[PDB]
Structure formats: C-alpha cells, structure tokens
Amino acid sequence: SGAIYVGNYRVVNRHLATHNDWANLVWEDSSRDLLVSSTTAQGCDTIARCDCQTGVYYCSSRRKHYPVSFSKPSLIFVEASEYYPARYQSHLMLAVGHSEPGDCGGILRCQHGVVGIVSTGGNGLVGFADVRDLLWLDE
Ligand SMILES: NC(=O)[C@H]1CCC(=O)N(c2ccccc2)C1
Numbered sequence: 001s002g003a004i005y006v007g008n009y010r011v012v013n014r015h016l017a018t019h020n021d022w023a024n025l026v027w028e029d030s031s032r033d034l035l036v037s038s039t040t041a042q043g044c045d046t047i048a049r050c051d052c053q054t055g056v057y058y059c060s061s062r063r064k065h066y067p068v069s070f071s072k073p074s075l076i077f078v079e080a081s082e083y084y085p086a087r088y089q090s091h092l093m094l095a096v097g098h099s100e101p102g103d104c105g106g107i108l109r110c111q112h113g114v115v116g117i118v119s120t121g122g123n124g125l126v127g128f129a130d131v132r133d134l135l136w137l138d139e
C-alpha cells in the first residue's frame with residue numbers, strides 16, 4: 001500500500017484505488033496502473049522533474065529502503081494477476097530488487113523528489129509507475 005500527496009491530489013496504484021478515490025476521480029490510466037483522486041487537505045510531497053535513473057525506494061516486505069538504478073519509462077510486458085490480464089504496461093521503470101504484491105505504493109525518490117510508485121514485481125525485479133511526466137499534479 002501507499003500513496004503520493006501533492007497539492008489537492010492523491011496518487012495511488014489504480015488496482016488499489018478505494019470507493020472514495022473513484023467517487024473523487026481526477027484521472028486514471030489502466031495501461032499505467034495509476035489513478036489520481038482529489039483531496040480536501042493540501043499535500044506537501046514534491047514531484048521530481050528530471051531524467052534521473054538512480055534513487056531509493058521503500059520495500060514494505062523488508063521494512064527497508066533500497067538504493068537502485070532503474071530504466072527510463074517504457075512499455076514493458078507484465079504477467080497476468082487478479083487485476084489485469086497479461087499486457088504491456090506503459091511508463092514503467094524496472095530495477096533489480098525485491099517486490100511482492102503488497103509492496104505496491106512504496107515510493108521511489110531521487111534528489112529532486114518523488115519519481116514514482118512500486119507497481120510490479122517478481123523474478124528479482126521491481127517495477128515503478130513513473131509520475132514525473134504528470135506536470136499538472138503541480139497546479
Ligand atoms: N501493475 C500490475 O499489473 C500489478 C497488478 C497486481 C500485482 O499484484 N502486481 C504485482 C506486483 C508485485 C509483485 C507481483 C505482482 C502487478
């Protein structure tokens with residue numbers, strides 16, 4: 001689990017979105033596993049605006065943060081789960097690391113701010129849904 005809180009927005013994994021997230025929907029993209037809902041309280045997370053390929057992510061199944069090198073956002077084949085059939089997920093970044101289903105929502109951060117959230121895993125890889133291209137989150 002986990003979310004990003006920036007301005008009047010909440011960013012979550014689309015497959016973990018709640019009834020309240022869907023009742024206050026701003027934007028969702030199934031191909032990216034992202035959903036953004038509106039909030040009444042102001043969030044103070046900072047989104048990174050950069051092309052970093054190194055950062056640190058939180059892994060709840062280890063209660064640890066790990067430093068990782070990750071690929072640039074791209075279209076990557078993702079195995080089927082209970083939430084989606086096997087498909088290409090877009091705007092996904094991969095790194096070598098640990099990720100279980102419950103790790104989704106953990107934040108990946110660089111020196112500039114939040115880069116994305118854990119969205120995929122298995123086979124010793126961890127995949128993060130990028131949020132750096134969503135410039136509107138800042139206004
Ligand atoms: N983005 C996705 O398609 C998610 C769907 C649900 C799910 O549990 N995914 C997953 C995450 C970590 C390890 C193993 C699988 C992938």
Ligand SMILES: [Zn+2]
Pocket residue numbers: 048049050051052110111112113
């Ligand atoms: Zn950066």
